[PDB]
């Protein structure tokens, strides 16, 4: 109902993402939210700790599973309002598009 980012104070985020960068050597913190104008369901959880070696596509696979979104319906992940290549590694998108607060913000829609 409210973009995670606007939901908490910077220091609260940078603190956590930093505590995350400590407790997990090869994991990645991802905030995954629904595009405002997409019909597809709103996920229950939006903070993920994705494995270093995980690809975009695979991560998509995970989101689909989370909303129980049927193979006919299409979904799309965006980063910085861009469509990362499905073959990419999440870590790479992170190191290249993370937020100043330490998280990699990702949105999904399909419609």
């Amino acid at each position: 109902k409210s973009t995670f980012k606007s939901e908490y104070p910077f220091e609260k985020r940078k603190a956590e993402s930093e505590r995350i960068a400590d407790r997990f050597k090869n994991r990645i913190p991802v905030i995954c939210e629904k595009a405002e104008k997409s019909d597809i369901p709103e996920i229950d959880k939006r903070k993920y700790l994705v494995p270093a070696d995980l690809t975009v596509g695979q991560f998509v696979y995970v989101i689909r599973k989370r909303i129980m979104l049927p193979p006919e319906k299409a979904i799309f992940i965006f980063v910085n309002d861009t469509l990362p290549p499905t073959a990419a590694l999440m870590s790479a998108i992170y190191q290249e598009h993370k937020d100043k607060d330490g998280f990699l913000y990702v949105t999904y829609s399909g419609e």
Binding site: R27, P29, K45, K47, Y48, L49, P51, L54, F59, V62
Partner: peptide, 6 residues
């Protein structure tokens, strides 16, 4: 809070 992927 956080959901870890395997």
């Amino acid at each position: 809070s956080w959901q870890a992927i395997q």
